[PDB]
Design a protein around this ligand. Structure first.
Ligand code: HEM
Length: 184
């Protein structure tokens, strides 16, 4: 179960975050650590498409090869805090698993600047969830976490030393698919 009410960044700049570009997960922390693998690749695009607030997600387990994309429509709870449906799609946006009420994630932007961010998500897939997940994001897939984002981790009363890096997994991303999926 999820246990955290993540606080959104004071003065969050929504248009900069949701600009249509890609964010890579460089480091992650699940508060129920066994809920997810120890080696992971994830990225997202976030933007407004024809007036609608959207995210496109990519997950890849570098050991099993399990791969999936999702297209999400975000509803606003407050500035920087969203509830997202999700539909599982192929990389071209064709629906594999349709939207359904019980399949949603919350998404809170705790810190962001032009290059880096700290987010919280709580996934619900039916009666289950995947624990609280925190993710450090960067615009550059290879960037080590800098002082702005590490300080934000501290300000959330978390320890960056506990976060697991994605950098040693040979992660390769289809940026074109993530951008195009925003429209789907
Ligand atoms: C690097 C950090 C992350 C890890 C380790 C991770 C891990 C996972 C895993 C293992 C699943 C599959 C659960 C299952 O078997 O059903 C999953 C599903 C999912 N995750 Fe994450 N995830 C991460 C980041 C994110 C982020 C940032 C978001 C939200 C923006 C997110 C949203 C989702 C969604 C929506 C699903 C369900 C997809 C579907 O069934 O269509 N994940 N994640």
């Amino acid at each position: 179960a999820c246990t955290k009410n993540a606080i959104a960044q004071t003065g969050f700049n929504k248009d900069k975050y949701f600009n249509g570009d890609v964010w890579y997960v460089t480091d992650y922390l699940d508060l129920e650590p066994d809920d997810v693998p120890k080696r992971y690749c994830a990225a997202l695009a976030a933007g407004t498409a024809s007036g609608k607030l959207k995210e496109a997600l990519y997950h890849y387990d570098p050991k099993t090869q399990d791969t999936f994309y999702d297209v999400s429509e975000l509803q606003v709870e407050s500035l920087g805090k969203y509830t997202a449906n999700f539909k599982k799609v192929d990389k071209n946006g064709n629906v594999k698993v349709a939207v359904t009420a019980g399949n949603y994630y919350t998404f809170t932007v705790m810190y962001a600047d032009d290059s880096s961010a700290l987010i919280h998500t709580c996934l619900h897939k039916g009666n289950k969830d995947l624990g609280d997940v925190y993710a450090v994001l960067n615009r550059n897939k290879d960037a080590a976490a800098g002082d702005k984002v590490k300080s934000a981790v501290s300000a959330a009363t978390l320890e960056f030393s506990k976060f697991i890096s994605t950098k040693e997994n040979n992660c390769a991303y289809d940026n074109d698919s993530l951008k195009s999926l925003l429209t789907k």
